[PDB]
Structures are given as C-alpha cells and as structure tokens.
Coordinates of C-alpha atoms in Angstrom, one line a residue:
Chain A
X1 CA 4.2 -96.5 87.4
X2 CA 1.2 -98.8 87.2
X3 CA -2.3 -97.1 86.5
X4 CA -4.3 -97.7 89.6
X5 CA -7.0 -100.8 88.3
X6 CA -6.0 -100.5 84.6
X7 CA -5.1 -103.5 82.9
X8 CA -3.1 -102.8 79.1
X9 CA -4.8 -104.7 76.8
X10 CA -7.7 -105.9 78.3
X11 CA -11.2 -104.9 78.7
X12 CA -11.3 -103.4 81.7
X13 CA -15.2 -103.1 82.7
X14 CA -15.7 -100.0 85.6
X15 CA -19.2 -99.2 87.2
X16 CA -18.4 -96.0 89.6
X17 CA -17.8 -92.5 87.4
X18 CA -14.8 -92.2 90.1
X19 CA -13.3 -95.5 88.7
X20 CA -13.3 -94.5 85.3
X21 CA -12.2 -90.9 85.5
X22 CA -9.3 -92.0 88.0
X23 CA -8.2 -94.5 85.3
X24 CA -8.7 -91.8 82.3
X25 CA -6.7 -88.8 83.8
X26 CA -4.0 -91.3 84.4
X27 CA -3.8 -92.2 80.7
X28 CA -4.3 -89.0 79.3
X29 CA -1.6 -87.6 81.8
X30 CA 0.8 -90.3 80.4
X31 CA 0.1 -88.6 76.6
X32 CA -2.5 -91.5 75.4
X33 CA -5.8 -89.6 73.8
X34 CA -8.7 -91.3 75.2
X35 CA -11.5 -92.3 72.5
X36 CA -15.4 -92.2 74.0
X37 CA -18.0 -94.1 72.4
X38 CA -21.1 -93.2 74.2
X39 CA -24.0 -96.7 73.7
X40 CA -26.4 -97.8 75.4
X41 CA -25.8 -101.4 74.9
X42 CA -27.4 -104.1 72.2
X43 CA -24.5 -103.5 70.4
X44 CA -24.2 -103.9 66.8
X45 CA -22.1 -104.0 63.9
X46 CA -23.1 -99.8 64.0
X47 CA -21.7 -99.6 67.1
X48 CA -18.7 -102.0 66.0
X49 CA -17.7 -99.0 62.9
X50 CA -17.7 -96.5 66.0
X51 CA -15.3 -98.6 68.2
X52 CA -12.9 -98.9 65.0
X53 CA -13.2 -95.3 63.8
X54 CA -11.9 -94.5 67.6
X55 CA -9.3 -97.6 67.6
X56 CA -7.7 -96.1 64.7
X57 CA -6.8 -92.7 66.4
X58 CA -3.0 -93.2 67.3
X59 CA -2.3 -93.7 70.6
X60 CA -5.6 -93.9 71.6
X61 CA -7.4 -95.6 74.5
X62 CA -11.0 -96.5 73.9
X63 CA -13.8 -96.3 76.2
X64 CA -17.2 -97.8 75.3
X65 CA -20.2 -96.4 77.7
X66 CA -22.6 -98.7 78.1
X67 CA -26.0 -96.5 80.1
X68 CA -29.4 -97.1 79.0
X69 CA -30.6 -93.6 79.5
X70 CA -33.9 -93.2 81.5
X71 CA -34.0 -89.1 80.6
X72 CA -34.0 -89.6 77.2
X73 CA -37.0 -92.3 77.2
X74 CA -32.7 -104.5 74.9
X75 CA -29.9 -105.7 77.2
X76 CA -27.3 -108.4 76.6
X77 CA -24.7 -107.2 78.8
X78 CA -22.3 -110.2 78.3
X79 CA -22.9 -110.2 74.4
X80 CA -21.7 -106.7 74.7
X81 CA -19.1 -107.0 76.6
X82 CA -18.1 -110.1 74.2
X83 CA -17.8 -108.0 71.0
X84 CA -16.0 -105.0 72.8
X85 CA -13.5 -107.6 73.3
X86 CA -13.0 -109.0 70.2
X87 CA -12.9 -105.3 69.1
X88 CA -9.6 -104.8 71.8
X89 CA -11.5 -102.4 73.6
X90 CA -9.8 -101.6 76.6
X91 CA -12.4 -100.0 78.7
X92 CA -16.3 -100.5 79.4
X93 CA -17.8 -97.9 81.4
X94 CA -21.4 -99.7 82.8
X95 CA -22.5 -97.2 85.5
X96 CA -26.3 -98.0 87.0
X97 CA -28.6 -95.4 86.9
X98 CA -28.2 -94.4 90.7
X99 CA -24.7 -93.6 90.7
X100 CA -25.7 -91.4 87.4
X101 CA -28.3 -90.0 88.9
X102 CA -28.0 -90.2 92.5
X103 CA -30.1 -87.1 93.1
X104 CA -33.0 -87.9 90.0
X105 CA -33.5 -85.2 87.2
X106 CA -31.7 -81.7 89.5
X107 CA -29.7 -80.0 87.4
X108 CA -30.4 -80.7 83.3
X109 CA -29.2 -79.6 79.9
X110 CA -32.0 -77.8 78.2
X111 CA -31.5 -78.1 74.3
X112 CA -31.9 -75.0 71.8
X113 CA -35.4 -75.0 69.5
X114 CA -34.1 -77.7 67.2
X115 CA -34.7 -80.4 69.8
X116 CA -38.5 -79.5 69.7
X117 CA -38.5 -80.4 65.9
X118 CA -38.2 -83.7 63.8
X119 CA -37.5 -86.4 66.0
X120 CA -38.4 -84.0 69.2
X121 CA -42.2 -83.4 68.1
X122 CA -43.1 -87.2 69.1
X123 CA -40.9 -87.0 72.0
X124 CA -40.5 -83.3 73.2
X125 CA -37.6 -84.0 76.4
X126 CA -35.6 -86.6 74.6
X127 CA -33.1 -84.9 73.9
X128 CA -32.5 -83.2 76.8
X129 CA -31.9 -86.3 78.5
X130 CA -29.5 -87.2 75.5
X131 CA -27.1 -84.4 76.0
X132 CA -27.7 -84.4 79.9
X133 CA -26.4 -87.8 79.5
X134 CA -23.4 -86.9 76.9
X135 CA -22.5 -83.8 79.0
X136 CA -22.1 -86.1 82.2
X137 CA -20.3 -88.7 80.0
X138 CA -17.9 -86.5 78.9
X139 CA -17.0 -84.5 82.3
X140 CA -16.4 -88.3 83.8
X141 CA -14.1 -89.6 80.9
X142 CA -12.9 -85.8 79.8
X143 CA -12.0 -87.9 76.2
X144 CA -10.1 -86.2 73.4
X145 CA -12.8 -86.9 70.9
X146 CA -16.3 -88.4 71.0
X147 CA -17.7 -91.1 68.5
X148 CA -21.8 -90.6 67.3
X149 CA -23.3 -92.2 64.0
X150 CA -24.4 -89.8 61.6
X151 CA -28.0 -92.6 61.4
X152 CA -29.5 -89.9 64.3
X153 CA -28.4 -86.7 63.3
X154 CA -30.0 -84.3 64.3
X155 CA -28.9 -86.0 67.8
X156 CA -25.4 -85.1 66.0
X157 CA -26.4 -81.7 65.5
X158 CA -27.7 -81.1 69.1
X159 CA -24.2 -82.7 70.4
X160 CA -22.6 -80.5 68.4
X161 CA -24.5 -77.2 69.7
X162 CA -23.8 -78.8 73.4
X163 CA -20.1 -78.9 72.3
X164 CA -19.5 -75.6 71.2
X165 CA -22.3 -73.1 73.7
X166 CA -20.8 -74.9 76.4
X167 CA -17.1 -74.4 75.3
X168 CA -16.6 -78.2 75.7
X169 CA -12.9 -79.0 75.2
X170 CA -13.7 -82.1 72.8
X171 CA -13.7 -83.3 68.8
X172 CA -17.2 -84.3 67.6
X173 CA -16.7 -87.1 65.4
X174 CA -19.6 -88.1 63.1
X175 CA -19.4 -91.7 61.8
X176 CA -21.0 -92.8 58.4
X177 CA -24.1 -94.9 58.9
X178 CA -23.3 -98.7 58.8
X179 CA -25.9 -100.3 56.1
X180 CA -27.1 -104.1 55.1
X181 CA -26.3 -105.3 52.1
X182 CA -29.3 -103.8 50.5
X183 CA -28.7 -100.1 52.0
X184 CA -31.2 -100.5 55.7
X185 CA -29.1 -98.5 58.2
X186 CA -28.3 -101.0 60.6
X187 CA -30.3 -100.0 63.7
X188 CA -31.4 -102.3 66.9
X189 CA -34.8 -101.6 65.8
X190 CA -34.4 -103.5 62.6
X191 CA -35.3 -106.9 64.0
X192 CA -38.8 -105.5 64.7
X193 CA -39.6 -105.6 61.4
X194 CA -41.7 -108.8 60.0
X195 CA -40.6 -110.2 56.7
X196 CA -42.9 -107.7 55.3
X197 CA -41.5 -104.5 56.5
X198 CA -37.9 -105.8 56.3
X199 CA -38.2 -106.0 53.0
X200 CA -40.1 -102.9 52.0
X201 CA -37.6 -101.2 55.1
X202 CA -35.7 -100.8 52.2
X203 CA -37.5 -97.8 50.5
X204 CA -36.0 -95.2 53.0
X205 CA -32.3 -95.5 51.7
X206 CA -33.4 -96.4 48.2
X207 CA -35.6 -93.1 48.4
X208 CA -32.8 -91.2 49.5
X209 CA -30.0 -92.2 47.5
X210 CA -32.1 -91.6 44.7
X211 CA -32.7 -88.3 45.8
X212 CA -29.0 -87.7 46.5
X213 CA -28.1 -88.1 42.1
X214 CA -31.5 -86.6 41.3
X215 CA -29.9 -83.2 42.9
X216 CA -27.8 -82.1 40.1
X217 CA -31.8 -80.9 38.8
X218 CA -32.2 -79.3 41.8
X219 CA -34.4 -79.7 45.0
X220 CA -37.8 -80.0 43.8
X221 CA -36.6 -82.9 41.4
X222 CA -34.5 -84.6 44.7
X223 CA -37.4 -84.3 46.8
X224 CA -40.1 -85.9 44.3
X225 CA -37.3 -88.8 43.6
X226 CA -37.6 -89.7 46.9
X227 CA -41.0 -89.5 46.9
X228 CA -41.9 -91.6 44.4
X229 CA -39.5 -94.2 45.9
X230 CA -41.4 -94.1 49.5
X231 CA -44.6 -94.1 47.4
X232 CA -44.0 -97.4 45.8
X233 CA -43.4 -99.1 49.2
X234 CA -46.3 -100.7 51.2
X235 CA -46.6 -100.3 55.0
X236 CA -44.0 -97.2 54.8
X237 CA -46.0 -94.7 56.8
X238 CA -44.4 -91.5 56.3
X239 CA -44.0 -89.0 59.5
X240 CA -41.1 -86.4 57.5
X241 CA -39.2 -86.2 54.6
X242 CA -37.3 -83.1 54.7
X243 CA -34.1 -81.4 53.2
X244 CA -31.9 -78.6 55.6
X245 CA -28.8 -77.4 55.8
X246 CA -26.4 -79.4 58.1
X247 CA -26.8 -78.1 61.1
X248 CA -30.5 -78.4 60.2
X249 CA -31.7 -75.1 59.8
X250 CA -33.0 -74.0 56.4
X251 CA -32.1 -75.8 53.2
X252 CA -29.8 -72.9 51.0
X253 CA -31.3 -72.2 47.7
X254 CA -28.0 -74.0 46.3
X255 CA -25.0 -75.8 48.3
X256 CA -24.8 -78.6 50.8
X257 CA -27.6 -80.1 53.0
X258 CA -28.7 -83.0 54.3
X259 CA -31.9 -85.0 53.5
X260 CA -33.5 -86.8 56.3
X261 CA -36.3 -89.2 56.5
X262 CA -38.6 -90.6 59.5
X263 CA -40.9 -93.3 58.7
X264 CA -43.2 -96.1 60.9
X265 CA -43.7 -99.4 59.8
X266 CA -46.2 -100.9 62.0
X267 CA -45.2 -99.8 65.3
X268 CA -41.3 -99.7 64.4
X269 CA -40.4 -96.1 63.7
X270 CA -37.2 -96.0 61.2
X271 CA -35.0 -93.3 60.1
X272 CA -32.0 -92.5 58.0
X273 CA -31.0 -89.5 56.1
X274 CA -27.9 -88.1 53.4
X275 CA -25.9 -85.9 52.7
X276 CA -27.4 -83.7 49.7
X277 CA -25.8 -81.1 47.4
X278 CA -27.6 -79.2 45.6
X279 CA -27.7 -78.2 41.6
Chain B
X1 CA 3.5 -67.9 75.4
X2 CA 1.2 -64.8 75.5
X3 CA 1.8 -64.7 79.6
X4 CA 4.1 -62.6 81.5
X5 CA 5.1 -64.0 85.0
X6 CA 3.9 -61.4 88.1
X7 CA 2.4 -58.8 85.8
X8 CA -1.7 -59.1 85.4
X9 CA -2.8 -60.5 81.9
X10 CA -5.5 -59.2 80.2
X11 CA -7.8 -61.5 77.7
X12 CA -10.4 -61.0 76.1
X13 CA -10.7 -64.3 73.5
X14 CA -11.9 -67.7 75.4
X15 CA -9.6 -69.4 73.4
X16 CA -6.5 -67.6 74.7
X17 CA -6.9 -67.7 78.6
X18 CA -7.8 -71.6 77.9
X19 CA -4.7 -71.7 76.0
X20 CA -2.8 -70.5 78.7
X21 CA -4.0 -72.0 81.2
X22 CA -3.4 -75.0 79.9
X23 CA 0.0 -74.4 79.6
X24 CA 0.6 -73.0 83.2
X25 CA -1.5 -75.8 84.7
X26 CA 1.7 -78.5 82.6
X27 CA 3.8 -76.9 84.3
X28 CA 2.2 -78.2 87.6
X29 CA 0.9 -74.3 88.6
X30 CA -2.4 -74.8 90.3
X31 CA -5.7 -72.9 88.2
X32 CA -7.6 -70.9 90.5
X33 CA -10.9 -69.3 88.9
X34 CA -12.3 -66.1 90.4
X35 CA -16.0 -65.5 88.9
X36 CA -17.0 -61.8 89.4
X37 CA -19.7 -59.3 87.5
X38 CA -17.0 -56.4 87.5
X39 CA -17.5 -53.5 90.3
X40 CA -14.9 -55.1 92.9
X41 CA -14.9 -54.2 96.4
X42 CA -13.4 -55.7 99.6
X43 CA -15.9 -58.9 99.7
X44 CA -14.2 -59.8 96.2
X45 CA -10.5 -58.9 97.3
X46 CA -11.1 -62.0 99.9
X47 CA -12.1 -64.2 97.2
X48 CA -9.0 -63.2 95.3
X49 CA -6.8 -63.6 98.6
X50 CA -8.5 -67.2 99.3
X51 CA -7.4 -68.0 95.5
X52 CA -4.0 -66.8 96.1
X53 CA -3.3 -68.4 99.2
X54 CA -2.8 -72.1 97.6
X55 CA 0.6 -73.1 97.4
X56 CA 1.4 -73.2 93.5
X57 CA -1.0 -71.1 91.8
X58 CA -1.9 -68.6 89.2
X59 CA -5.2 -67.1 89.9
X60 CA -7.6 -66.3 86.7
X61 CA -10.3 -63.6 87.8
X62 CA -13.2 -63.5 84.9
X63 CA -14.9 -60.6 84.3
X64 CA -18.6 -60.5 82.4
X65 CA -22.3 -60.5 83.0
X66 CA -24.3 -61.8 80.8
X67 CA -26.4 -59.9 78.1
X68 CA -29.5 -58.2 79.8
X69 CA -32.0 -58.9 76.2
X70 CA -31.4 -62.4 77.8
X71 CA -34.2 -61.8 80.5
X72 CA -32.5 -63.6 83.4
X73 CA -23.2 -50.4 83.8
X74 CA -19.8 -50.0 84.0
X75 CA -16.4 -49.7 82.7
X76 CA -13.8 -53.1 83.5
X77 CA -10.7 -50.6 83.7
X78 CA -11.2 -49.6 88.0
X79 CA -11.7 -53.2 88.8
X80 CA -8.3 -54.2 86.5
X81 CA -6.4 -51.5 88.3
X82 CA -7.6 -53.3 91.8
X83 CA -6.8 -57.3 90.2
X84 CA -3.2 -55.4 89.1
X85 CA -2.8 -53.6 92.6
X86 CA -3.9 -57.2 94.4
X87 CA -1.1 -58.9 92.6
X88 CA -3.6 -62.1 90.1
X89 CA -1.7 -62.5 87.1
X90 CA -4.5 -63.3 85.0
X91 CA -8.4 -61.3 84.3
X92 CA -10.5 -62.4 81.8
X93 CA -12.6 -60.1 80.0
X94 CA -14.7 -61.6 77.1
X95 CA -17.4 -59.8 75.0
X96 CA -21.1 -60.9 75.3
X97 CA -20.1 -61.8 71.5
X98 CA -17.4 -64.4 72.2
X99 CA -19.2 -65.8 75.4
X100 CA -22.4 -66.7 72.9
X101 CA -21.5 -66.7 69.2
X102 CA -24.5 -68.8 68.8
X103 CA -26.7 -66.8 71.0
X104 CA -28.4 -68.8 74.1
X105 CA -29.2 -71.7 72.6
X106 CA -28.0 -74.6 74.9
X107 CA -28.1 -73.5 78.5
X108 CA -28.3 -75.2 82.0
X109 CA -31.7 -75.9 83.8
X110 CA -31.2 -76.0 87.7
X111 CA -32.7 -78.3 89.6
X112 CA -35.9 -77.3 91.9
X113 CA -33.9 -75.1 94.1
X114 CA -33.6 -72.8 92.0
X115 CA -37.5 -71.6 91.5
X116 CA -37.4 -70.7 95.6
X117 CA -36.0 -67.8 97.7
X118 CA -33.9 -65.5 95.0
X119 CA -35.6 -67.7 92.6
X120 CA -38.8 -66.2 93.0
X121 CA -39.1 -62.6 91.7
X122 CA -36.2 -64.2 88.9
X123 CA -37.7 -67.6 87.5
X124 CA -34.5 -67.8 85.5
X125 CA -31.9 -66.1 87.1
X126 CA -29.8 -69.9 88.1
X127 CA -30.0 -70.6 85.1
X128 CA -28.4 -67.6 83.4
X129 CA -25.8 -67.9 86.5
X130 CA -25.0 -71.7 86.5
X131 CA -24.8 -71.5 82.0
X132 CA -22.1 -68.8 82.2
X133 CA -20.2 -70.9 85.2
X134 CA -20.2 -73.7 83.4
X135 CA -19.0 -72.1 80.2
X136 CA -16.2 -70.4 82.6
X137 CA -15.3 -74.1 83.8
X138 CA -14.9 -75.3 80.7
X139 CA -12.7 -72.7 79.3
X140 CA -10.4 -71.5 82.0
X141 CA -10.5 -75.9 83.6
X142 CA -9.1 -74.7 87.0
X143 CA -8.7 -76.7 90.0
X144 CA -10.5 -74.5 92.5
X145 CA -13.3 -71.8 91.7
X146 CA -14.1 -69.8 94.7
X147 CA -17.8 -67.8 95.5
X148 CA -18.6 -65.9 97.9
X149 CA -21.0 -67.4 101.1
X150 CA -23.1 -64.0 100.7
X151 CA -25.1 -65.1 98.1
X152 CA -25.4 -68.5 99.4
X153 CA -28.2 -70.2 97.4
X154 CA -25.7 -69.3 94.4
X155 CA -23.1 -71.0 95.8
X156 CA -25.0 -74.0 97.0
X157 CA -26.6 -74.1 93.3
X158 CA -23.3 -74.1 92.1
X159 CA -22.4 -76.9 94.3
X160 CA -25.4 -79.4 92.8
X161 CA -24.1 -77.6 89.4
X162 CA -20.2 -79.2 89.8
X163 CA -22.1 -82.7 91.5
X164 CA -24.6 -83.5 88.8
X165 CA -22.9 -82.9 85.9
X166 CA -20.2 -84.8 87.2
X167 CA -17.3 -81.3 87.2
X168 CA -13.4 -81.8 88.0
X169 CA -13.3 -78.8 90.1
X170 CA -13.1 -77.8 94.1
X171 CA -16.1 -75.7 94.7
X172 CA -14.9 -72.9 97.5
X173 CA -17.4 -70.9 99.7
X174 CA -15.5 -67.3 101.6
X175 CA -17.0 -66.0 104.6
X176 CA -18.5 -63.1 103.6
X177 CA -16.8 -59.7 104.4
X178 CA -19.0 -56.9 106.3
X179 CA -18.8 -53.3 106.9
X180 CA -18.1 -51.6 110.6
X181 CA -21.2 -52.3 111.5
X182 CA -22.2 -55.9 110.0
X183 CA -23.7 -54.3 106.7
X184 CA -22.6 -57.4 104.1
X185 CA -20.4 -55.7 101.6
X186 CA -22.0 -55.9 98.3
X187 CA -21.7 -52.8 95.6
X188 CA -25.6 -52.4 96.2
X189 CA -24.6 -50.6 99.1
X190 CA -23.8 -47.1 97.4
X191 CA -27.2 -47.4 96.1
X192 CA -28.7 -46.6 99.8
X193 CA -29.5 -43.0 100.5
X194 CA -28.3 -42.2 104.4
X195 CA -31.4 -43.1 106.3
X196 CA -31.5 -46.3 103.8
X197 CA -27.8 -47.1 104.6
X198 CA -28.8 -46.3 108.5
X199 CA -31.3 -48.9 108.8
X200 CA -29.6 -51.6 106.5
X201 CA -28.0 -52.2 109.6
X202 CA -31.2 -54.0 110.8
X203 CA -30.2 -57.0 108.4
X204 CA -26.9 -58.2 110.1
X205 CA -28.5 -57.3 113.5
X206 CA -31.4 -59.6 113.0
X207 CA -29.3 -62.5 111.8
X208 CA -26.7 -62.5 114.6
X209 CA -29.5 -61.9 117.0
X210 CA -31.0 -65.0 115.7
X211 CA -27.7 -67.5 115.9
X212 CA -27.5 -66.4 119.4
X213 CA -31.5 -66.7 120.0
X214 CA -30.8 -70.3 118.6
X215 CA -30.6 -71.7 122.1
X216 CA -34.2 -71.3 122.5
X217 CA -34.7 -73.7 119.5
X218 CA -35.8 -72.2 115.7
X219 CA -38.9 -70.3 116.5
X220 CA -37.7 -68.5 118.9
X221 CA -34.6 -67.6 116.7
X222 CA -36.4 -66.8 114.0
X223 CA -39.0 -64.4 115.8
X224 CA -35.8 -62.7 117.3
X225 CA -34.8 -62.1 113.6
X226 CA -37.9 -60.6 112.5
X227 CA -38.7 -58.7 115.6
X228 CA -35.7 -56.8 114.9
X229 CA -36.1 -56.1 111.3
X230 CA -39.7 -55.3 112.3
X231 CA -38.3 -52.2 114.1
X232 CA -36.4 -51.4 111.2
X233 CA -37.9 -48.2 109.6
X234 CA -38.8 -48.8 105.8
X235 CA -37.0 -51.9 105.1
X236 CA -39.4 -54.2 103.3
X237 CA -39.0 -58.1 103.8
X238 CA -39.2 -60.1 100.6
X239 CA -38.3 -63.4 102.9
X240 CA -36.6 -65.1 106.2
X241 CA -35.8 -68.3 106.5
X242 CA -34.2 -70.6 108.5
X243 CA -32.9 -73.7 106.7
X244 CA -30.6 -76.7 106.6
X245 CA -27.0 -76.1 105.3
X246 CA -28.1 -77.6 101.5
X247 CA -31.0 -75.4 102.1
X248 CA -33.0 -78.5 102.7
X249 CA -35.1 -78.7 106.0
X250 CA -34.0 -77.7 108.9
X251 CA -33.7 -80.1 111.4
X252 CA -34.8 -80.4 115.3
X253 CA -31.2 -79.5 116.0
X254 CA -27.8 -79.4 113.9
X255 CA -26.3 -76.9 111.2
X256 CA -28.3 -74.7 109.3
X257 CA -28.7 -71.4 107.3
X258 CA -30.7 -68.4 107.9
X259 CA -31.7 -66.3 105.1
X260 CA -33.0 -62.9 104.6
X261 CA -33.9 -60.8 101.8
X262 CA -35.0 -57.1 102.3
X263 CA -35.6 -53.8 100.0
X264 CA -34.8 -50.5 101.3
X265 CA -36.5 -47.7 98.3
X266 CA -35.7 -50.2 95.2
X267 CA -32.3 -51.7 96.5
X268 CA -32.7 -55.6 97.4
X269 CA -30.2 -56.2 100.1
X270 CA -29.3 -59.9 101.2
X271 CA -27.6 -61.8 104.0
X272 CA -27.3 -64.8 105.6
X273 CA -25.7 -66.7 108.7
X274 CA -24.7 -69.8 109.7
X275 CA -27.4 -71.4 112.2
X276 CA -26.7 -73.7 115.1
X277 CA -30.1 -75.3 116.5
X278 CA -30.2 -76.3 120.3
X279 CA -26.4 -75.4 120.7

C-alpha cells in the first residue's frame, strides 16, 4: 500500500493542510512517529540543529513548516527547500496565508499573562499569533513531538503552557541554541548588524556565560557579571537583563533558572539567554 | 485495560479516558464524544442515541462545567444512572482540578460571533465554552462530537472552533427535542412557576408561526413571530432574529435561522427554527 502523494526519501513539498494531514495520518497509522519543525523560512544552520535533533528520533518522518506568520508580526524559498534536502527531509509543508487563514483572525489562542511581559511589552499580540499558528500546525500534521530553539524561550515557555492547558497530545522539545564561533546565537537577524555591532553582538553571550560560572556566589554576583560585560560593549542598548525560574515566573532564592537578555543594536533587536543555577 | 465491554465506565482522570480511548479507537471502534453540563433530560438522551447509532462505536459522554470564580448545582450520580440505563459505555467526569491544573491560563478567543446574540449579556461565555471543547477534543480525540441545534449559536461557534483551528473531528448538530406542546426541552424548564411554564408556550408558537409566515417574505415572518410573543403575558424579549444558516445575513430568499431569546421571572428561555425565505 502506497501513501497517496508520498514519495520515501524525497522531499516532498505540500501547500493544502488537507495534503499534508492526508499524507501524515497515513504514516503515523503505518507506526512511523512524525517529527514537526515549525519555521518560517530563511533557514539557517539554527534551523539545520532542529531538522537533525528530529531526524534522529527512530523511525521518524520529518516535516519542516515553512509559514511566515502575519498574526505574530526574508524569503528564499528555493534556498530553503535546497538545504531541507541535503538535510533528507522528507516533507515541506509551504501553505499561503489564505488557505491558513481563509476566514482572517476568527477564532484565536489568547496567551496567559507571560505573553504581555519581556518580549510581549514591545509587541503585546505576538504571541498570540505564535501559538494560533503552532496550535493550527499541530492539529494539521498531529506530529509526535515538536522541535523549538531554546534562542526564544519564553516563545518555548508559552508553547509549553499551550501544550499542556489545552491537553495537546504532543512532546515539546527544546533544542540548545546554535552559536558562531565566538558564542552569537545564530539568528536571521544577525546579518543586520554592521561590522560594528557584529563584533560588539558578542557581549550578550559573553555576558551571560559569565554570569552562568559567576552563580556559584549567588545571584546578585551573576547578575553584576553580566553587567559589567554588557557595560563594556559599545552600541549594546540594553531593553532586559533578567533572571526567572524556567517557566519564567520568579527566580527561587536558590536552584535552577534561566537568565535572559534582550538587547538593540541600532535598529536590530538581539536576544539570547542560559540556563542558570543558583549558589 | 481499565474498560469493561457493555457496562458504563466511569473516569474521572483525563489521562485515563484518553488512554482508553486510544485503545478502543486501534481496535477500529468509532469515538463518539457527547459534551453535556450534567442534569440530563430527553433533549440529551437524543444526542446520546445519534452517538450510538454509528455503526462501530463506543460513545464517551463528558460530564463538567467549568468553575463559576471563572466569570464566564448538582450531584453527577442521577445523570450516570440515565448514561447506565441508555446503554454508553463510557462518562467522563473530571474535577475543575484536573480540567485546569494551571488555572485559566491559555484559553480560546472566538471569533466576532461570539460578542452578539447570547454573547451579549455574557462577553465571555464562547470562550469559556469553545476552551473546555477544545480541551475535551484533545483528550477523548473522537471521530464525531455531537451538540445539540437548541443552542445554535454554540453549535455554529463550535463549527468555526473545529474549521479554524484546523480539528480532525465531525461536528454533529440534533434536532432539538420539545415538550407536548413545542416548549424546547432544556432543564430550565423546572425553573418556571405554572403561569411561567403556561406562557413559555409563546416561544415555539411564535417561531413556527414565523417559518410558515415565511411565504410572505422575512418581515412579514418576523412580525408574525413577535406579534405572538407580544400577546404572551410576562415573557420579556431579550432578542428575535432572523438570520442566515452561519448566522450571517439573511438573504432575499434561501435557508436561514430564526432566533429568539425570552425571560419569564429570572429564567432565560431560548429557541430557534430553521427559516425558509420565499418558499
């Protein structure tokens, strides 16, 4: 029995939610787990570590979404579609915006209170149209697990919450942040930056790292370690530098958090974060 | 495991009827999900009978309303004895604790339709009801979940609800049951004190007067409608309107819906009929 449009080993590119679904139910039904790795194009090597954290699941079928989001507000479509290959994708889900949202903005996901803070002061509906998008993403592909880089995290976080108040039957995977040689988290916004600002770009891990050994003094001593870092760079304009728990809530007097870090150099806003432990 | 064939299982832990239904729905027995608040009566029975009338399956009837602090009285054991008596094989009963661990934190925001007609005096009532749907989706995954036509912008909310967020899942409108009389069954009913029940009558009368007015064209059937609920003694009408099937426009001619909502003391009473315009 052949899957209906599914070609084994190749990238198979889909563009109707019916098209895709179809083709996933079939595989899961025949016992493969399908992998979704939710993008929204401009791929890069980030993007690439996703794709192989969800190749590596055992009998697993990967499907890349490729949706540049309007809700939640670069395009090289063939260079995409060129490294999903090389990666042995096997499926590129590139729906337009109509057949996503054939009826505009009806029926939405509205986030708890933690998508009004950090990243959702300077943009307070973002992520609703992030996990709008994610929840419709998964009900088309229903994967076993979904992919997200742990560079946005508190868009990790608020998947997370979607997951679970929502009784989603899916595995949130988190995925380490892919970094340059000198520690930038890789980020499509990186080539932005002028010479300048690449170069002093590099404060934000360098800060945070250093705040990460620092800890073992505690979290006054971590936070003024990263200070001091961010404060030798010029053109690093600071918007947050705060440490939480990790599901972002308030940092414990003692025990695990996570450090995160929003900063704008010229007009390119960059951020990163850590994982932190405390004493 | 943890299901016993023609008897009616009881569950109170999401995690066990999805369990279960997973299982039953391998060995190729069709999910049917039955959404009630508890106090079942005749109009629920034919929900339950719909349900059971597809060829191989096991129907799950849920059981909960959601926590009243939300801002959008009675014991489960009478309705159980009627699900047992009815023959379903499956009734789940969570706890206000297990439906939200987390509290309401991520929820579902309807689309536009939901801020008109029951939407009015309840801003946020949709929402509650299309959040705890969802959730029910997710958990129980069946292949059909039935509603009831008698609250009808409910089930044509739930409709946009399965459409935009891209659901797996046959969305099933019954014909509503009525009483003797025409009085829409509904457990708001026993709240009407004789004279009340008496002229509840007026509601039914008014819509069927109306489909058969409808040859005279909309006006006319709509000034039938509310002439007679004008000569009904102390019923109070919050609204009556005559609409297109979505609850769009009505058209010059075609399908449509008529709508009424009334209050009789403090008991809202609701009703609604099918519409033919210019036939």
């Amino acid at each position: 029995m052949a899957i209906p449009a599914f070609h084994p080993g190749e990238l198979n590119v889909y563009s109707a939610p019916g098209d895709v679904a179809d083709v996933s139910r079939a595989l899961r039904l025949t016992g493969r787990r399908v992998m979704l790795v939710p993008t929204m194009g401009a791929l890069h090597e980030g993007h690439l570590a996703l794709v192989r954290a969800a190749k590596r699941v055992p009998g697993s079928v990967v499907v890349v979404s490729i949706f540049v989001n309007p809700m939640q507000f670069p395009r090289t479509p063939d260079d995409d579609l060129a490294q999903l290959r090389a990666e042995g994708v096997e499926i590129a889900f590139t729906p337009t915006t109509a057949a996503m949202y054939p009826d505009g903005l009806r029926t939405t996901v509205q986030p708890g209170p933690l998508a009004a803070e950090l990243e959702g002061g300077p943009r307070p509906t973002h992520f609703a149209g992030v996990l709008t998008v994610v929840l419709k993403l998964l009900q088309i592909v229903r994967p076993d697990r979904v992919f997200f880089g742990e560079k946005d995290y508190q868009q990790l976080v608020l998947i997370r919450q979607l997951v679970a108040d929502f009784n989603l039957d899916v595995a949130v995977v988190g995925v380490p942040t892919v970094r340059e040689a000198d520690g930038l988290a890789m980020s499509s916004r990186n080539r932005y930056l002028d010479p300048a600002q690449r170069a002093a770009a590099v404060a934000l891990s360098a800060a945070l790292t250093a705040a990460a050994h620092a800890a073992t003094a505690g979290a006054q001593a971590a936070l003024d370690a990263a200070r001091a870092v961010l404060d030798a760079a010029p053109g690093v304009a600071v918007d947050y530098l705060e440490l939480r728990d990790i599901g972002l809530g308030p940092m414990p007097l003692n025990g695990s958090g996570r450090l995160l870090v929003a900063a704008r150099l010229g007009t390119t806003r960059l951020l990163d974060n850590i994982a932190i432990e405390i004493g």
